[PDB]
Amino acid sequence: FGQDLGKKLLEAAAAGQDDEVRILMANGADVNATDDNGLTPLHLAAANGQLEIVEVLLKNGADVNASDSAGITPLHLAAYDGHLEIVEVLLKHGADVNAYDRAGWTPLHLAALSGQLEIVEVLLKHGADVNAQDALGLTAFDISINQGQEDLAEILQ
Amino acid sequence: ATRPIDGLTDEGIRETLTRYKKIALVGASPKPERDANIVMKYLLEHGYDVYPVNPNYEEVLGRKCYPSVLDIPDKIEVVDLFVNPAKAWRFVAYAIKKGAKVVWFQYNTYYPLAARQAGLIIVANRCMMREHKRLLGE
Ligand SMILES: CC(C)(COP(=O)(O)OP(=O)(O)OC[C@H]1O[C@@H](n2cnc3c(N)ncnc32)[C@H](O)[C@@H]1OP(=O)(O)O)[C@@H](O)C(=O)NCCC(=O)NCCS
Numbered sequence: 469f470g471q472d473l474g475k476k477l478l479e480a481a482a483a484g485q486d487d488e489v490r491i492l493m494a495n496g497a498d499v500n501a502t503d504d505n506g507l508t509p510l511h512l513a514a515a516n517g518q519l520e521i522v523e524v525l526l527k528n529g530a531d532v533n534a535s536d537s538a539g540i541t542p543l544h545l546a547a548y549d550g551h552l553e554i555v556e557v558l559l560k561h562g563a564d565v566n567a568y569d570r571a572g573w574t575p576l577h578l579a580a581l582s583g584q585l586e587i588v589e590v591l592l593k594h595g596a597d598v599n600a601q602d603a604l605g606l607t608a609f610d611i612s613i614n615q616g617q618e619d620l621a622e623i624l625q
Numbered sequence: 626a627t628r629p630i631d632g633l634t635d636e637g638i639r640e641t642l643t644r645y646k647k648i649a650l651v652g653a654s655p656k657p658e659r660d661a662n663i664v665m666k667y668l669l670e671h672g673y674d675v676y677p678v679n680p681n682y683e684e685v686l687g688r689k690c691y692p693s694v695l696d697i698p699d700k701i702e703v704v705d706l707f708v709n710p711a712k713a714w715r716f717v718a719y720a721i722k723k724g725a726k727v728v729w730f731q732y733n734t735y736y737p738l739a740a741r742q743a744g745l746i747i748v749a750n751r752c753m754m755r756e757h758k759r760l761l762g763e
Contacts, residue, residue: 482709507711515711516733536711538738545711548736571741581737603741 474501481521482512489521499530506536514542514558517551522558532561539569547575547591550584555591565594572602580608580624583617588624598624630735630749639760641727641746642753645702646674649694649725651716652707653677653685660731661707662686667754668705676701694719703727705753706734714739721745729753 477497480488489509493499502508510530513521522542526532535541543563546554559565566574576596579587588608592598601607612620648668652661665686668675677685680692691697694704694716704720706713706729713734720728721744730739730749739747 505712505715511711512709515709540711540738545736549710549733569738571738573737578737 470496470498470501473497475503477501477509478503478507478512481509481518481525482516484513484516484518484521486520486524489524493524493528499525499528500534505538506534508534508542510534510542511536511540511545514551514554515545515549517546517549517554519551519553519557522554526557526561532558532563533567535567539567541567541569543567543575544569544573544578547584547587548578548582550582550587552584552586552590555587559590559594565591566597566600568600572604574600574608576600576608576624577602577606577611580611580620581615583612583615583620585620585623588620592623627732627750629751630730631747631751633746633748635756635760638748638751638756641703641748642757642760645727646672647700647702648673648675648753649678649697649701649704649720649723650675650707651678651694651704651713653679653690654682655685659707664705664707664731664752664754667757671757694723697723701725703729705729705731707731708734710734710736714742717742717745717747 477492510525543558568574576591609621609624650665653665654661676697677688677690679690682690684690701723704725706716714736717728717739726744727746735749
């Protein structure tokens, strides 16, 4: 029963159980399973900062650019929650550095929103659109300025 | 890292803690490893009416546990969230249908699609237990 196995894979990934992810994978569960809202094991592993599990999902062919019904991707989640190593890797495996979610946010908007310096650096390195605009016509520049961190706005010009 | 993502003051925090007793707790569970467990214990122990929400359980800490928020018979005032950031923001919408006054994001649960959706009053990156201890605790 793949459903049960998929739900088991999702939780183990989110929970950072290296060993367990190995048992489900070597035992048939789909690395590309989804929940009711289109979340995949990679989304959850990138959200929670589980690096080694991110590596093993990609090696076995998990889609690096999977999106939920709100248009969220693993790169969105890793950048809002401050997981740099995971950002580094995602991009190495081809993550779309300029994907937009439902609110019209990119991973640049998102790193600005919770104020990650080192993650803003890597994104501009990999071609992030410093003039991308969200549903409300705002940039990652406008944002950090609203929030009062001039230095970031300085680097995000 | 425990820095408030909301901009309320603690007069604002004392208020919600103080006027609201009806609490939906999302992501509730029997596991001790889950922070939701201890916090529910602590709320129940300090006069709150707490209804656990988790479709993977019929029951939690000796309380009927519900599949969804929509599922709760009586009124709820505050929705207390213990789920993944890829997930929590979806409860803003349900709270609004329920007629709740507050949505509370515990640590590592917030994602900004939640502002775009929001009553209501949002609390983000704080613990209901710790704020209580600090503001009202003996
Ligand atoms: C959010 C957190 C639990 C991590 O979550 P996770 O590992 O990704 O697991 P999930 O987000 O998928 O879900 C957690 C749980 O709620 C459940 N759940 C999942 N989806 C759910 C849904 N749609 N509705 C209700 N509950 C759900 C689970 O099944 C579960 O508990 P279980 O292990 O007993 O089954 C964790 O970061 C945390 O506890 N944050 C808050 C900590 C904090 O505030 N501590 C304060 C101390 S004072």
